[PDB]
């Protein structure tokens, strides 16, 4: 538990995807709600994700230079 839900935006790596988490945050000064994006490099053992899928991810130990997150489950296939 403690997961983020995102969207796959790359799958061109062996056993690893890029997921984009989208947040809706009030602007500090001007008060308008803005869209903000975090991109995480996630681990996916069974290359079971394609570009456009909605995935659910959890934080784990470091797996490589840039990966510290791992796939929990696919929520919606593309």
């Amino acid at each position: 538990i403690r997961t983020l839900q995102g969207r796959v935006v790359s799958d061109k790596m062996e056993k690893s995807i890029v997921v984009a988490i989208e947040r809706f945050v009030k602007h500090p000064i001007y008060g308008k709600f803005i869209k903000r994006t975090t991109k995480l490099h996630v681990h996916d053992e069974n290359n079971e994700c394609g570009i456009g899928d909605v995935v659910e991810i959890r934080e784990c130990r470091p797996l490589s230079k840039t990966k510290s997150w791992t796939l929990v489950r696919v929520v919606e296939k593309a």
């Binding site: 001007y30 008060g31 308008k32 709600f33």
Partner: protein, 129 residues
């Protein structure tokens, strides 16, 4: 194009009062009716009615006390270009309590006074003085 129907309703009341119209009419919606109820109960308009099925029309009956119009001011607060939400304790007072702010809470549209008595924040639709 039309991108804010509520602002349009408030402008119809404002312009209608200034022109000494008896009543104003507009395309209906469930949010517009919700707001119309609050205005009626607080005594800023006389009555309202919806008429029609496929293309229903909301008609408001405006009020005048001793010649002058009852709604002195009516201002859209939250708007498509900039949404405004307030917590319970930050709910605005309009004309130091003599006016109302209309608030969309999770228990429906109501006055800012009624929202404080329920302990609810919400979206600030408009001020009416």
């Amino acid at each position: 194009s039309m991108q804010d129907p509520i602002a349009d309703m408030l402008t119809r009341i404002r312009n209608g009062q200034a022109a000494n119209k008896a009543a104003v009419t507009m395309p209906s919606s469930k949010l517009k009716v919700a707001i119309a109820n609050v205005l009626k109960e607080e005594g800023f308009i006389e009555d309202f009615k919806v008429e029609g099925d496929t293309k229903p029309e909301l008609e408001l009956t405006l009020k005048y006390f001793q010649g002058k119009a009852v709604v002195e001011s009516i201002q859209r607060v939250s708007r498509p270009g900039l949404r405004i939400y307030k917590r319970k304790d930050e709910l605005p007072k309009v004309m130091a309590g003599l006016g109302i702010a209309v608030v969309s809470t999770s228990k429906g549209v109501m006055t800012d006074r009624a929202a404080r008595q329920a302990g609810l924040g919400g979206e600030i639709i408009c001020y009416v003085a």
